[PDB]
Amino acid sequence: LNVEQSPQSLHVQEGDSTNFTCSFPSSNFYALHWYRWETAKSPEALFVMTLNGDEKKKGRISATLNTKEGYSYLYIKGSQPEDSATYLCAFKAAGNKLTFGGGTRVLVKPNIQNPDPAVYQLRDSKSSDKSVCLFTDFDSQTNVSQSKDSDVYITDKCVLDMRSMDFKSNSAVAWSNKSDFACANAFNNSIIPEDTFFPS
């Protein structure tokens, strides 16, 4: 009936390890399934566990099974970008159906090499007078806060990885309908690095 997962949300730096738990009924236990569900991908099956005291491994990911006490530990060794996902545990009793826990959402913060924080203004490719502000190349200590102003739009940070040079970078975009708006004040509500480049 009830499958619990905790912590529900965890942040981990790339290269660091983490673990979390799943609790399920000991009565009528047949199997435990673990999945890694990455954003807009198929939930990936990691392993099925049936034997008490067992430990299974899939690469850097491992899990344990306690059928008596009704719990499992999931371990992530040396977290990598692809490990950013919701980890779902699901219990099978005699029937075909799986009963799911609410998941553990894992955010693996990237290792940013040589951070060079900067706020750039980009102009529309088309003949319009539109522009966007791009805050980029800041390390994982920086949080991008929302705009205090309703007419100022600020996205959350996302990490891209240029495979042509094995380079990773964070960025957030800001834009505003306001005629007086400027890229120099766009991210004012965020604690940004002291040395952030504001081109002239």
Place this chain on the structure above:
Amino acid sequence: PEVTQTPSHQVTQMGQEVILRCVPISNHLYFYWYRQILGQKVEFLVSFYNNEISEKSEIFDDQFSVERPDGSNFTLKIRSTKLEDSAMYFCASSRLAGGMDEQFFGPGTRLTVLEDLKNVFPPEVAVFEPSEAEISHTQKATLVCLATGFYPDHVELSWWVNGKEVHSGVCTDPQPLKEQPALNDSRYALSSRLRVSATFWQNPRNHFRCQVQFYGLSENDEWTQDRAKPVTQIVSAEAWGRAD
């Protein structure tokens, strides 16, 4: 081998019939449907084996039905959609139904059920060219795509370089933002970045494009408004590389 489902998203008006399609793993005998309402747990709907239902939940009411029309396809029908049917629908399959049998999941179909279709609008899409300051500072070049004014919120944004979809150097906001948070039918905005080397951007024959697959109305959907029917469609914007 993988379980497949198409489309990734579907929009329907409440009360209409929806058919969701799946391709189980070819040599699997057990097929399943699960759903997940946003912020809730993935929940069992039905399992199927040897041309008949195997097990079904309470959620699999009078409105639901399953079909196995041939040896390759597997379908879930929702006779009359409710607002509460908005969810990610997953199809799964397993070789057998033993304790050690893995249930392999498809990528899901996200179904959005709307009370009315009058507030449905496709996005505007614009491509923003890399800043010369970034090019000179980093020897890198970031393009920004902005999809705006669309409703509902579950679009698919992609980048196309020289007519080929790219994934390297891309990151898209995992969720759109509300242009008017205080409104319940607020239009949405979504952004993405594509970063390339300065040398690549400076080649005037490199062609960049941002494409947004919008999910909206179908041919069957009735439309009595003056504006263009907001059908499922692709909206794009482009930019060519620049030497100077």
